[PDB]
Enzyme design. Structure first.
Site, PDB file in Angstrom:
ATOM      1  N   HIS A 164       0.586  -1.245  -0.098  1.00  0.00           N
ATOM      2  CA  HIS A 164       0.312  -0.165   0.106  1.00  0.00           C
ATOM      3  C   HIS A 164       0.938   1.265  -0.361  1.00  0.00           C
ATOM      4  O   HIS A 164       0.165   2.550  -0.274  1.00  0.00           O
ATOM      5  CB  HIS A 164      -0.640   0.143   1.312  1.00  0.00           C
ATOM      6  CG  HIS A 164      -1.707  -0.942   1.567  1.00  0.00           C
ATOM      7  ND1 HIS A 164      -2.592  -1.812   0.231  1.00  0.00           N
ATOM      8  CD2 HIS A 164      -2.193  -2.179   2.100  1.00  0.00           C
ATOM      9  CE1 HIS A 164      -3.892  -2.086   0.423  1.00  0.00           C
ATOM     10  NE2 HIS A 164      -3.420  -2.735   2.217  1.00  0.00           N
ATOM     11  N   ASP A 195      -3.076 -10.771  -1.935  1.00  0.00           N
ATOM     12  CA  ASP A 195      -3.611 -10.191   0.036  1.00  0.00           C
ATOM     13  C   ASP A 195      -5.722  -9.571  -0.575  1.00  0.00           C
ATOM     14  O   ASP A 195      -5.917 -10.153  -0.972  1.00  0.00           O
ATOM     15  CB  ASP A 195      -2.802  -8.639   0.268  1.00  0.00           C
ATOM     16  CG  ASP A 195      -3.130  -8.397   1.244  1.00  0.00           C
ATOM     17  OD1 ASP A 195      -4.198  -7.560   1.727  1.00  0.00           O
ATOM     18  OD2 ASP A 195      -2.233  -8.833   2.130  1.00  0.00           O
ATOM     19  N   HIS A 218      -6.778  -6.912   0.209  1.00  0.00           N
ATOM     20  CA  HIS A 218      -6.999  -6.065   0.262  1.00  0.00           C
ATOM     21  C   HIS A 218      -6.111  -5.658  -0.896  1.00  0.00           C
ATOM     22  O   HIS A 218      -4.945  -5.898  -1.382  1.00  0.00           O
ATOM     23  CB  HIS A 218      -6.262  -5.050   1.139  1.00  0.00           C
ATOM     24  CG  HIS A 218      -6.553  -5.348   1.930  1.00  0.00           C
ATOM     25  ND1 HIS A 218      -6.602  -6.145   3.293  1.00  0.00           N
ATOM     26  CD2 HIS A 218      -7.885  -4.251   3.083  1.00  0.00           C
ATOM     27  CE1 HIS A 218      -7.061  -6.467   4.414  1.00  0.00           C
ATOM     28  NE2 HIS A 218      -7.652  -4.848   4.129  1.00  0.00           N
ATOM     29  N   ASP A 261      -4.463 -12.753   5.048  1.00  0.00           N
ATOM     30  CA  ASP A 261      -5.497 -11.898   5.160  1.00  0.00           C
ATOM     31  C   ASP A 261      -7.009 -12.832   4.822  1.00  0.00           C
ATOM     32  O   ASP A 261      -8.207 -12.347   5.411  1.00  0.00           O
ATOM     33  CB  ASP A 261      -5.725 -10.382   5.804  1.00  0.00           C
ATOM     34  CG  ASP A 261      -4.868  -9.961   4.343  1.00  0.00           C
ATOM     35  OD1 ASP A 261      -4.725 -10.567   3.518  1.00  0.00           O
ATOM     36  OD2 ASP A 261      -5.108  -8.615   5.111  1.00  0.00           O
ATOM     37  N   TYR A 281      -2.823 -10.863   9.832  1.00  0.00           N
ATOM     38  CA  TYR A 281      -3.548 -10.456  11.658  1.00  0.00           C
ATOM     39  C   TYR A 281      -3.636 -11.867  12.389  1.00  0.00           C
ATOM     40  O   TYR A 281      -3.829 -11.221  13.301  1.00  0.00           O
ATOM     41  CB  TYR A 281      -4.130  -9.238  11.380  1.00  0.00           C
ATOM     42  CG  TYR A 281      -3.910  -8.536   9.974  1.00  0.00           C
ATOM     43  CD1 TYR A 281      -2.969  -8.011  10.976  1.00  0.00           C
ATOM     44  CD2 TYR A 281      -4.734  -8.418   9.286  1.00  0.00           C
ATOM     45  CE1 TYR A 281      -2.273  -6.833   9.789  1.00  0.00           C
ATOM     46  CE2 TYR A 281      -3.996  -7.596   8.272  1.00  0.00           C
ATOM     47  CZ  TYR A 281      -2.750  -7.110   8.832  1.00  0.00           C
ATOM     48  OH  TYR A 281      -2.955  -6.208   7.467  1.00  0.00           O
TER      49      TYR A 281
END
Ligand SMILES: O=C(NO)c1cn(-c2cc(Cl)ccc2Oc2ccc(F)cc2)nn1
Ligand SMILES: [K+]
Ligand SMILES: [K+]
Ligand SMILES: [Zn+2]
Length: 401
Positions: A141, A175, A177, A270, A315
């Site tokens: 990111h 990912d 995201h 994730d 996480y």
């Protein structure tokens, strides 16, 4: 041969952040507990012979003023005094706040990931390794002058830049995201094709990688980079098989048409069903003869293209270690041919107690829109190939879907 980035100081720095804690230690120690380290070549993180050389490396993507501010943030967090009003404004102007706070090692921590992924790129370029893994990297990111999503420096962009400056790179972002920072860095570049599969929905970070605002359009690059940024947004709840079927033909068609010199894979964990995001329902399951992650990595590695495998989100630290340990063993198996035997029970080691209460390697989980995206992506791939004078069988690619 398969490399992996590690070192004593590297481990300490990768474990020094408030958000990711000791995750990297769990990952590397579980890999070690499963006796995989003797199969892997240690790739040492890159160091430089001067501050100017380090700055020159990092500012190949990031602005000098951003790098200055990040170094100042670390300096300010190593003293007990609070930030002045002017220093707050300075940090806010680079989004060094909120989800990207300062902490006493924030520059050394972010730089370490860059050091690891640049060394990994170099190991591929000199043909020391066929695949290199860096579970301390994958911070997709971060932008030229902006921290984002607990990513401060974009080790992926810098690694890809090293690869292309040695040539086409295919970047694959698994990912949860959207891989927005990498996509933006190469938005105008036809030689780096980016492909992110991710969740997207209103209000969900970072917001890109989907239709955007007349009637919404799918942007896909600009200038000579038109059609070179690919995206597959998916609704919540997708399982291993459906995610595999969604991404599989896209990956094969990109490899056929692009014929990449290198592949760079971000493998953020994730998407696991047990991540606290609780969005996708992927696993780390591997039949003894199927995890979406392992499906995708096995397919990429079957292309026999030099490949960089990076970490990223994740996480649930034990389950992230559970996944990345299986990715590591799979890479050894595919690259070397040597079968890798992994006990279903977590081996005793320093972090054994973190794998309670059942101490298994498997994670603790009980398991039309995509057709439209496939047609759109197949059209964009044809457009990409037409713009860049590449030619390919416009029928064998179509057959893949
Ligand atoms: O991993 C990432 N991207 O690759 C990533 C994830 N977030 C993120 C964004 C928002 Cl608004 C809230 C929580 C976020 O993270 C989490 C989510 C759950 C958790 F228990 C720990 C951290 N930001 N970036
Ligand atoms: K992604
Ligand atoms: K691009
Ligand atoms: Zn993520």
């Amino acid at each position: 041969s398969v490399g992996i980035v590690y070192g004593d100081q590297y481990r300490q720095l990768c474990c020094s952040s408030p958000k990711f804690g000791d995750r990297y230690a769990l990952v590397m120690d579980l890999i070690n507990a499963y006796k995989l380290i003797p199969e892997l070549s240690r790739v040492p993180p890159l160091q430089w012979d001067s501050p100017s050389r380090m700055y020159e490396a990092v500012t190949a993507f990031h602005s000098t003023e951003y790098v200055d501010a990040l170094k100042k943030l670390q300096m300010l967090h190593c003293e007990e005094k609070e930030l002045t009003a002017d220093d707050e404004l300075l940090m806010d102007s680079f989004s060094l706040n909120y989800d990207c706070p300062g902490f006493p090692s924030v520059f050394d921590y972010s730089l370490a990931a860059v050091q690891g992924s640049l060394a990994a790129a170099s190991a591929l370029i000199c043909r020391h390794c066929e695949v290199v893994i860096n579970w301390g990297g994958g911070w997709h990111h971060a932008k030229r002058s902006e921290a984002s999503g607990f990513c401060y420096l974009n080790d992926i962009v810098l690694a890809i830049h090293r690869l292309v400056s040695s040539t086409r790179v295919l970047y694959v972002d698994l990912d949860l995201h959207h891989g927005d920072g990498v996509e933006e860095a190469f938005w105008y570049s036809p030689r780096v094709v980016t492909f992110s599969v991710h969740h997207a929905s209103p209000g969900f970070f970072p917001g890109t990688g989907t239709w955007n605002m007349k009637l919404p359009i799918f942007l896909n690059g600009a200038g000579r980079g038109r059609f070179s940024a690919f995206n597959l947004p998916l609704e919540e709840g997708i399982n291993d098989l459906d995610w595999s079927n969604a991404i599989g033909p896209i990956l094969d068609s990109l490899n056929i048409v692009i014929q990449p010199s290198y592949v760079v894979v971000q493998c953020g964990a994730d998407c696991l069903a047990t991540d606290p995001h609780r969005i996708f329902r992927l696993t780390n399951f591997y039949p003894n003869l199927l995890s979406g992650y392992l499906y995708a990595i096995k397919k990429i590695l079957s292309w026999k293209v030099p490949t960089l495998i990076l970490g990223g989100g994740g996480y649930n630290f034990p389950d992230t270690a559970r996944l990345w340990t299986r990715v590591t063993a799979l890479t050894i198996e595919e690259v070397k041919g040597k079968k890798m035997t992994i006990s279903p029970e977590i081996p005793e080691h320093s972090y054994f107690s973190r794998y309670g209460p059942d101490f298994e390697l498997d994670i603790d989980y009980f398991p039309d829109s995509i057709q439209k995206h496939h047609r759109r992506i197949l059209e964009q791939l044809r457009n990409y190939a037409d713009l860049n004078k590449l030619i390919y069988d416009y029928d064998q690619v179509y057959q893949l879907y």
